[PDB]
Amino acid sequence: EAEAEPLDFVVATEREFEEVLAISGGIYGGLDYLPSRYHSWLRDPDRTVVLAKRNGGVIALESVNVIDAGETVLVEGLRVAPWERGKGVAGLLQRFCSQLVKRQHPGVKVARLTRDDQLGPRELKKYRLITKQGILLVRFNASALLAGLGARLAALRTSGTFSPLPTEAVSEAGGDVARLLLSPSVQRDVLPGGTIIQDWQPYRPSESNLRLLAAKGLEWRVDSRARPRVLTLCTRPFPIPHGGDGTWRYLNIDAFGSDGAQVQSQLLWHLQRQAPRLVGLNVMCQLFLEPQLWSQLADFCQVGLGLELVKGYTEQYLLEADIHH
């Protein structure tokens, strides 16, 4: 039997927040950002959050955000209510949103997205792979980490097993971020596929996008400002639904470059910076890094820092498709 009422595509408002939550159960195994981010999305000037409704009720959501100085649309948050899946809803929503973008933003040349599910024949046919990072997901209690870290490092030092390497400060206000990310050799030799990936969101390394990043409260670290080889980027932690008790936060660290020892030392630096703010809370900490460094960093986290690995190796794919007419 056909559905009694047709699909309607509308721009999201704060009124649908509770309805959007109701369709989002179980997404990303509890690491879903949208509960914490929905209200900020509605304020973003280049973003349109589209809801698919049937008979007045929300059944799907997609966000399109124009970035890269008008040349790219980033697709985020695609979701269909569990009870509406497998019927083509996501496909219809994607088509409405692509038509909307082409209508309102003729300058947009490509669509981009990130994902971590295995790529099948279909994906490789429709999308170009710009780059990929390995994904390392660990969990810890922030207070327990802080209470034990001193003794942990001290034993690692006296054992001759690990000592933190020197790292260098990166100030956005001071202009360090721009000097690094606008350097063509950093873009070629450090950034994955020449791209900034920040909490799953890809940006071409441009002054326009640096203004967007500057507003997010990010923390950066580098091995050497004069001779950059490893650059790391920590996104401010935010609440996630995991566990259902409100105590969990998601801490995203993107690591760019090939020197595993510096990824280790910079990871430690970010943990020492961020964990004091997370006292009393539980942390899903997800590190994105060059794939050939994953095993080194997984051992460092589990053996070195006593952190608990949440899942095995997976990959973050940055995918791109041309816009067509």
Residues that bind ligand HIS (CB under 6 A): 28, 76-77, 113-115, 200
Contact between 206 and Cl ion (CB under 5 A)?
Answer: no
Examine residue 115 and tell whether it contacts Cl ion (CB under 5 A). no
Here's the x/- map for Cl ion, 265-304, by CB under 5 A: it reads as ----------------------------------------
| C-beta separation of 52 from 97 below 8 A | no
Residue 197's binding partner among Cl ion, ligand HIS, none (Cβ under 5 to 8 angstroms by kind) is: none
- Which C-beta is closer to ligand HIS: that of 218 or that of 305? 218
User: Which tokens is 121 given?
Assistant: 């024949």
Of 100, 61, 66, the C-alpha closest to 84 is 61
One-letter amino acid identity for 262? Answer: Q
Q: Compare residues 108 and 113 and give the one whose CB is closer to ligand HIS.
A: 113
Rg (CA), the chain: 21
72 or 167: whose CB is closer to ligand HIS? 72
Is residue 97 left, alpha or beta, with left meaning phi > 0 and alpha meaning psi from -120 to 50? alpha
Number of residues that bind Cl ion (CB under 5 A): 3
As a whole number of angstroms, the distance between CA 232 and CA 218 comes to 10
Gap between the Cα atoms of 223 and 277, Å rounded: 24
Pairing verdict, β 7-11 and 47-54: antiparallel
**Quick one: tokens of 190?**
């450090």
Q: Which is nearer to Cl ion, 6 or 120 (CB)?
A: 120
**Chosen from ligand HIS, Cl ion, none, partner binding at 198 (C-beta under 5 to 8 Å by type):** none
Whichever of 84 and 168 has its CB closer to ligand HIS, that residue is 84
Determine if 315 is a binding residue for Cl ion (CB under 5 A): yes
Look at residue 315 and give the partner it binds from ligand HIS, Cl ion, none, a contact being a CB closer than 5 to 8 Å depending on partner kind: Cl ion
Pull the structure tokens for residue 198.
């920040």
CB of 124 to ligand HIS, least distance (A): 17
CA distance linking residue 87 with residue 90, whole number of Å:
8
Binding region for Cl ion (CB under 5 A): 116, 314-315
